[PDB]
């Protein structure tokens, strides 16, 4: 097979020779250790050394013998509950035989080769396969995680080896086609399993918040950013994607997230609760996260990898919930490209590819009826930040701002007590006039009339905004100080939420439904109240105040009685004056 | 009123679909018997083409 | 073979033996995955040539490089069995109808509009809506940009106005058969929902037998992108033109096709501009538009409408400032507007149409038009100087005139701007103004003249 | 009326890839008949002429005899594996243009699709 040495060794610049049968974009082994290259150009004889696990003692004269795969992702069992690379190694195995250090030169396994799972045949020889049919049902722990046949690949059965257990490697299920349906199979990410169209979402997805669900909401499908710039507290709605969240099966990537901001979040998950089930959370979630500490190439994989470990579960039945975790680290890792092979980047600090390697994994997957018919959904809510610290370049407007939502961060916005939080002016929902229909019937008929009306005053305070940076209003009268405080205990205790405690968030239908009440009432009844001769002074010092200011410290649970009690508490000490 | 006036243009949204294919069908047909006597002309036109 | 082949670095390729090859030529590479790739040929020399993959760039390998040559020329059909069909893309099958229907191999860009062989604008068409069609004419072969903003949903806003657009030239004498209904869409870089959410309207209700779609995928590569306005913008010339049909083109999101564009060039040996974006936009945008205007003795011509996104609206780019010297007027978009829900969302003073009354007259959208026009300009935006200010003026100085002013904006957003998905014509357009007009006095109305409100009040 | 634009190219279609079936198995039998040397010649003729220098003018070795008079006019032609056409090889590298009855086939309802509308419908 494809032969050649080092050339050149230069860090991670690094120039083979003698490449013969080499193809672009293809995984390899290059030094005495094997360090896990991928060929990034090819010139003839000589072809640039993409080079993963860092260089300690490589040289000249080392072999450069190539794998002949883009990258391929190997399929079948093991996935669910585990710490996996972007370009699929186990963390758990590299932690296991070598120390608490990662030792560069240390390749283990691709997916499992020493875990055999239960086979039950569920296809005989009879008959004949087709791409997205089932082989079997294999059980890992409490989800249901079946194989199927990669799409382009089918043939006709013409043996299924009987009931008990096998090792991963092994096929189980043969074909009169060359090929052989295993538990460990090569696909190319390049080529990640087809769908039969594009289709419009219409059901939302739920985050179990009161912002993100409720004034601007996210879809099951979707697709949407939430920019805080240069860390704003953009990694705590994964706190709120934790255990709160809607998604059967949860996949968790990071492009290359620096250790310290996933040492508590990446520890505390399998600590968690699992709502799909009970014990951890790593029964629904992969994890598939790749870190600072992982290679500095293999973050710039990472994302157009781990997008069909996505797909293999979404395709099935499922409705996944991928987010990669700041899209700004596959940025640096992207215009690091130019640096290494002499190159400038696109200029003025953006990346020399722009919509080519970002776009298309976004709209690979979100809402799409499948060649199964099967319905599969890919919801991200992605966890970016701008590169250049503004947002009017190009990577953030050409998926990260015509994306299903919105909302924008400040630095001493979050700092008062909101984590996550969202701005009261400069959150806009993209997509929402497709997803009243399942608001109204599941939640509440009268749902899609009580968040337009609570936006209303919260945005429309932004006219009183500019007025204060101007002259600023010393005209104090009823109806002026009526959108004032109102608005303002809107963003004191609404936006501020904690997903820090079980009592600031995590939100059910009737939660969401009566908090959102709560308030439009009391300003409805200070509206008529105002208007006859009450001062909003004596309106502030009433003990119904307080009653929204206990509105954040109240259990899902104990949420429906909380309610039902305090809404004779509003008419009376209202209507009443 | 409204409802003798959409069960109404259901019967005549209906009656309009069955001619179109009607004429469809006929015309279907018209394409395929004014080429079948114009064939070997094709076939000479194509071949002609193909072989220098 | 036609190897050479050095920096095959994402989808850039060198090779030699490019003596054989033309600049805007198009060319099958061959390579043992079996997959078998287009890409233009650009940037050409007797040795090292420029060729950008159509499909990615993963399979090109050192076995094979041969190159069978398709066309030196490009080669581009003239349909006119596309008025009436969708296609994504270049042109690919999705209601199962075949790409193109050839005529003629012309290339893809034979020239724009000869000057001497184009005529002042004299016709009018309607879009179903009031303040862009009354208090603005929406003129014969005009080219109008609607500049829209960042967070805000651009592409819903546009063919939401596709349905209701159902021209009216009544008026004048003329009828929708002398100017048809004919949309032709060439977006790029659209979302999974959106591109879906398109075909939609167009199904709904019996507008997809007298339009064609394309729409390049913002999943489908940054080289086809370019390609795709050039297809349809050939196929146009003899639809409108040489049918004496009339074309409206709507385009949409002009960000991608600039981000694009940007690449292709930087390998040229061509600098990118001011704010990244490129300096070579401007040739290369104007051959799109400018197959726009009227045609001495050829009645049909295509109306083109760009829509293009900013984050504000600010004009501190060029992505505003290029298109804004070729094109005329700017209808930008207002963030209290959208939030009350009053579509389509049009400032006061900010918006302006250049041209309004040279493309109508009087009795062709009706007498009292002319001075109507010019009311509802300057009655609108004085209510937009209290439309916040009535407790910033406290309730110790309040007068009638202006407070009668508030109540007119409350009525002028919620009946005259917006008008929902119902279809209006000109005449139905018009009667919504008279009637708000109907509370303000005479001594209010200022702008238009005794002898029209004689006519009508 | 999309109706009838969807029955009419199903029509439209069976007639095109029937003209194909017919056209195609002339070609299946064409070593067959007795005009296959002032076909296989002229093909060949383009390709010397154009881009390949004569390096090689290769060909199948069943078609060598029916080939072997223009080899003595030029290049030495010793296979595309169809036997139903002649690859050109140049002096440039190898340069490549395969000049096959199936190749000239598959665009010439993509290079010239006008010409076959013509002669069955107008």
């Known amino acids: ?216 909401p996210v879809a099951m499908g979707g697709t949407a950013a939430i920019p805080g710039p240069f860390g704003s507290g953009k990694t705590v709605t994964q706190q709120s994607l934790a255990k709160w969240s809607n998604a059967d099966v949860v996949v968790y990537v990071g492009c290359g997230e620096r250790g310290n901001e996933m040492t508590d979040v990446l520890v505390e998950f399998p600590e968690l609760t699992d709502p799909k089930t009970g014990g951890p959370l790593m029964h629904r979630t992969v994890l598939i ?62 990346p020399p590819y722009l919509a080519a390697r970002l776009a298309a994994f976004y709209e690979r997957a979100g809402k799409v009826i499948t060649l199964g018919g099967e319905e599969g959904a890919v919801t991200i809510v992605g966890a970016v930040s701008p590169p250049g610290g503004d947002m009017s370049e190009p990577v953030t407007q050409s998926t990260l701002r015509i994306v299903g939502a919105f909302w924008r961060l400040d630095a001493s916005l979050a700092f008062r007590r909101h984590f996550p939080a969202i701005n009261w002016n400069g959150s806009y929902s993209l997509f929402t006039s497709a997803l009243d229909p399942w608001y109204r019937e599941n939640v509440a008929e009268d749902y899609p009339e009580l968040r337009d009306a609570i936006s209303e005053l919260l945005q429309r305070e932004a006219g009183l905004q500019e007025i204060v940076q101007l002259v600023g209003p010393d005209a104090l009268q009823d109806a002026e100080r009526l959108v004032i405080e109102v608005g303002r205990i809107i963003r004191e205790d609404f936006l501020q939420q904690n997903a820090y405690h079980e009592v600031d968030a995590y939100c059910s239908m009737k939660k969401a439904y009566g908090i959102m009440k709560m308030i439009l009432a009391f300003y409805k009844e200070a509206e008529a109240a105002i208007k006859r001769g009450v001062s909003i002074d004596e309106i502030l010092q009433l003990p119904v105040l307080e009653r929204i200011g206990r509105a954040r410290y109240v259990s899902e649970e104990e949420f429906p009685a909380y309610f039902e009690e305090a809404m004779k508490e509003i008419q009376g000490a209202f209507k009443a004056l | 009123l409204e409802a003798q006036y959409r069960e109404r243009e259901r019967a005549e949204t209906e009656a309009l679909l069955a001619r179109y294919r009607e004429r469809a069908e006929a015309e279907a047909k018209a394409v395929r018997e004014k080429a079948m006597a114009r064939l070997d002309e094709a076939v000479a036109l194509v071949l002609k083409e193909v072989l220098p | 073979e036609y190897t050479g082949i050095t920096y095959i670095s994402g989808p850039l390729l060198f090779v030699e033996n490019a003596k054989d090859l033309a600049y805007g030529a198009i060319v099958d590479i061959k390579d043992g995955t079996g997959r078998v790739r287009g890409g233009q040929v650009i940037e050409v020399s007797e040795e090292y040539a420029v060729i950008q993959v159509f499909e990615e760039t993963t399979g090109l390998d050192l076995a094979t490089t041969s190159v069978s ?150 999943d489908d590569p940054t080289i086809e992108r370019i390609l795709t306005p050039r297809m349809a913008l050939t196929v146009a010339e003899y639809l409108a033109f040489e049918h004496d049909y009339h074309v409206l083109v709507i385009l949409t999101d002009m960000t991608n ?54 984050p504000d609206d600010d004009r501190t780019h060029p992505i505003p400032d290029l298109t804004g010297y070729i094109t005329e007027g700017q209808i930008q978009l207002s963030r209290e507007l959208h939030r009350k829900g009053i579509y389509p969302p049009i400032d006061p003073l900010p918006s302006l149409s250049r041209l309004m009354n040279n493309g109508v007259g009087k009795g062709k959208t009706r007498e009292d038009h002319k001075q109507v026009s010019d009311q509802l300009y300057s009655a609108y935006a004085n209510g937009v100087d209290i439309r916040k200010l009535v407790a910033i003026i406290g309730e110790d100085a309040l007068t009638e005139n202006d407070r009668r002013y508030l109540q007119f904006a409350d009525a002028f957003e919620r009946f005259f701007i917006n008008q929902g998905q119902q279809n209006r014509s000109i005449e139905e357009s018009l009667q919504i103004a008279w009637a708000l007009l109907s509370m303000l006095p005479q001594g209010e109305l200022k702008r238009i003249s005794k002898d029209h409100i004689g006519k009508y009040y | 009326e999309l109706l009838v634009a969807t029955a009419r190219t199903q029509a439209r279609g069976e007639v095109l890839e029937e003209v194909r079936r017919r056209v195609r198995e002339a070609l299946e039998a064409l070593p067959q008949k007795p005009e296959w040397p002032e076909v296989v010649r002229k093909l060949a003729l383009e390709a010397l002429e154009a881009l390949p220098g004569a390096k090689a003018l290769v060909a199948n070795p069943e078609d060598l005899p029916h080939l072997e008079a223009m080899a003595r006019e030029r290049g030495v032609e010793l296979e595309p594996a169809l036997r139903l056409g002649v690859r050109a090889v140049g002096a440039e590298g190898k340069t490549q243009v395969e000049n096959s009855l199936l190749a000239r086939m598959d665009r010439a309802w993509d290079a010239m699709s006008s010409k076959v509308a013509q002669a069955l419908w107008g």
């Open chain 1, 1 to 216: 097979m494809i032969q050649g040495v080092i050339q050149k060794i230069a860090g991670p610049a690094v120039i083979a020779k003698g490449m013969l049968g080499a193809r672009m974009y293809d995984i390899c082994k290059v030094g005495e250790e094997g360090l896990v290259g991928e060929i990034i150009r090819l010139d003839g004889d000589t072809a640039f050394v993409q080079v993963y696990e860092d260089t300690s003692g490589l040289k000249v004269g080392e072999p450069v013998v190539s794998t002949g795969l883009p990258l391929a992702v190997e399929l079948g069992p093991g996935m669910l509950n585990g710490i996996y690379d972007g370009i699929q190694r186990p963390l758990e195995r590299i932690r296991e035989k070598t120390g608490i250090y990662i030792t560069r030169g240390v390749v283990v396994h691709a997916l499992d080769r020493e875990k055999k799972w239960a086979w039950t045949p569920m296809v005989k020889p009879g008959d004949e396969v087709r791409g997205g049919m089932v082989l079997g049902t294999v059980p890992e722990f409490g989800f249901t995680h079946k194989i199927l046949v990669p799409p382009d690949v089918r043939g006709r059965v013409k043996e299924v080896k009987p009931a008990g257990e096998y090792t991963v490697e092994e096929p189980v299920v043969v074909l009169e086609d060359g090929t052989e349906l295993k538990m460990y199979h090569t696909w190319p990410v390049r080529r990640a399993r087809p769908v039969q169209r594009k289709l419009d979402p219409n059901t939302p997805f739920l985050t179990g918040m009161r912002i993100l669900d409720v004034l601007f």
């Open chain 1, 289 to 350: 996260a790749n870190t600072s500490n992982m290679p500095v190439a293999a973050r710039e994989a990472s994302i157009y990898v781990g997008v069909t470990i996505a797909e293999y579960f979404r395709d099935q039945g499922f409705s996944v919930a991928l987010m990669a975790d700041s899209t700004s680290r596959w940025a640096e890792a992207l215009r690091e490209i130019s640096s290494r092979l002499e190159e400038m980047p696109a200029e003025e600090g953006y």
């Open chain 3, 69 to 218: 040559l398709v066309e030196d020329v490009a080669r581009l059909g003239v349909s006119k069995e596309m008025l009436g069909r969708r296609f994504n893309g270049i042109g690919k099958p999705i209601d199962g109808l075949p790409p193109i229907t050839p005529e003629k191999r012309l290339p893809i860009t034979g020239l724009p509009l000869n000057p001497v062989a184009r005529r002042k604008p004299e016709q009018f068409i309607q879009t179903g809506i009031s303040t862009i069609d009354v208090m603005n004419t929406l003129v014969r072969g005009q080219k109008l940009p609607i500049f829209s903003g960042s967070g805000l949903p651009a592409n819903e806003i546009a063919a939401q106005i596709a349905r209701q657009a159902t021209v009216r030239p009544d008026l004048s004498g003329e009828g929708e058969k002398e100017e048809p209904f004919a949309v032709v869409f060439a977006a790029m870089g659209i979302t999974q929902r959106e591109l879906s959410y398109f075909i939609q309207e167009f199904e709904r209700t019996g507008a997809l037998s007298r339009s064609v779609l394309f729409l390049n995928k913002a």
């Open chain 3, 257 to 310: 096709y600039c981000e694009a564009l940007r690449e292709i060039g930087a390998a040229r040996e061509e600098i990118p501009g001011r704010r990244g974006y490129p300096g070579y936009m401007y040739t290369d945008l104007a051959t799109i538009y400018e197959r726009a205007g009227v045609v001495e003795g050829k009645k049909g011509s295509v109306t083109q409408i760009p829509i293009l996104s900013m």
